Design a protein around this ligand. Sequence first.
Ligand SMILES: CCCCCCCC/C=C\CCCCCCCCCCCCCC(=O)N[C@@H](COP(=O)([O-])OCC[N+](C)(C)C)[C@H](O)/C=C/CCCCCCCCCCCCC
Ligand SMILES: *[C@@H]1O[C@H](CO)[C@@H](O[C@@H]2O[C@H](CO)[C@@H](O)[C@H](O)[C@H]2NC(C)=O)[C@H](O)[C@H]1NC(C)=O
Ligand SMILES: *[C@@H]1O[C@H](CO)[C@@H](O)[C@H](O)[C@H]1NC(C)=O
Ligand SMILES: *[C@@H]1O[C@H](CO)[C@@H](O)[C@H](O)[C@H]1NC(C)=O
Lengths: 98, 271
Amino acid sequence: QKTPQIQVYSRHPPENGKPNILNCYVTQFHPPHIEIQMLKNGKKIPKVEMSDMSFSKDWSFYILAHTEFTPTETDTYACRVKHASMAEPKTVYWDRDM
Amino acid sequence: KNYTFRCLQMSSFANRSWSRTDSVVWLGDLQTHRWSNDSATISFTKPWSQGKLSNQQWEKLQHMFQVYRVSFTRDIQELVKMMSPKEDYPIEIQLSAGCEMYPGNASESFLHVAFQGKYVVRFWGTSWQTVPGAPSWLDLPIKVLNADQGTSATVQMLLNDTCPLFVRGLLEAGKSDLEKQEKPVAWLSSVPSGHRQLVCHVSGFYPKPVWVMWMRGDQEQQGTHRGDFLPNADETWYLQATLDVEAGEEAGLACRVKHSSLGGQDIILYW
Ligand SMILES: CCCCCCCC/C=C\CCCCCCCCCCCCCC(=O)N[C@@H](COP(=O)([O-])OCC[N+](C)(C)C)[C@H](O)/C=C/CCCCCCCCCCCCC
Ligand SMILES: *[C@@H]1O[C@H](CO)[C@@H](O[C@@H]2O[C@H](CO)[C@@H](O)[C@H](O)[C@H]2NC(C)=O)[C@H](O)[C@H]1NC(C)=O
Ligand SMILES: *[C@@H]1O[C@H](CO)[C@@H](O)[C@H](O)[C@H]1NC(C)=O
Ligand SMILES: *[C@@H]1O[C@H](CO)[C@@H](O)[C@H](O)[C@H]1NC(C)=O
């Protein structure tokens, strides 16, 4: 059993009011069964695209989730993951102004 | 130059009546195929995913894989049945097969198998073999498998002939994608950890190789910490390089980015 790592990053330089894409890249986990949510101000984002699941040279799995978003000054984004390796869901917040 | 072609199979067995097998295929870092469990046919993820194979050649190849997928699932469920309660459910099996292409017309092929996240079995030369330290209960089933000369011959054909043949065709047909150049866009921010961590973000570049460094004038800052290559969803890359800096020492720092797409014209951003 292996714990997922999570990295959250935007496709383009974040500009408030400008359409962009936020990525949540989830890696190093096993077994391959996993639930990934992207969050806007603590609420699940409905339209989130998932890449096909794949795996690395060390056999650990990875997958990319992404969603279209327009950054504002006050909106906060996160990626929350549920996996059998963890008793509690793991949440990582988008860094921008942290 | 060097290209690795990887067929990646992911099979999950939760119990007697629940299994799924999904596959993806990669040429270098570009996905060429996807084969979902709930699809009868292999799906193309590029215009050129059929390479230089004729429709008939592809159909023959696909049918073999279709037969294989059903056969593999039956064989494993039967292996588990005759393995109670040595190693029971859930069971994860992964298979990684393909060939690495080298300058000239040379290549080396591979077929590796992992059980519960651990490498246990390879096909090598003319036979399946367990790797040193693999569970001993695998010995007899691998010997049984090795008695199937039909499967052995087919695997030999696939690794020795079919793989490099198919990949040569992919490399010709996929040339404009494989040799594409996408320009990085960079930006600077900071995050916590008085010290601050300065961040140089580099995004949207292709191909993968890239040089990112924090600089004070001509001096490379050896505190520069490069992260991992992270994929964007549009077949480009993302990387960041950080530098932890004392408060009031930020002035004079720059991030320099070198990339093949920029033709010698580095991006330089100033903090
Ligand atoms: C490989 C590169 C070729 C280029 C093609 C590129 C296109 C790729 C597109 C999608 C690919 C999908 C990914 C598939 C992965 C490749 C797998 C290759 C194997 C092909 C074999 C075909 C023959 C066949 O299907 N063999 C099976 C069926 O045989 P059969 O008697 O039913 O008849 C088949 C037809 N034949 C011509 C007579 C052989 C046979 O039963 C072994 C199946 C099991 C083999 C895997 C065992 C591995 C050991 C795991 C044990 C450890 C786990 C522990 C268990 C508890
Ligand atoms: C596929 O290639 C392998 C070599 O990579 C061949 O395996 C060799 O086979 C001969 C006799 O069959 C053995 O004496 C060698 O020891 C094998 N080499 C290795 C490295 O194990 C195999 O014969 C080839 N199969 C086909 C159909 O061409
Ligand atoms: C087998 O596993 C699947 C997937 O977890 C589950 O939905 C199903 O209920 C299980 N079946 C039995 C008979 O336990
Ligand atoms: C996967 O595909 C097989 C073969 O068609 C099917 O029987 C099985 O129910 C599928 N698994 C899941 C979890 O849907």
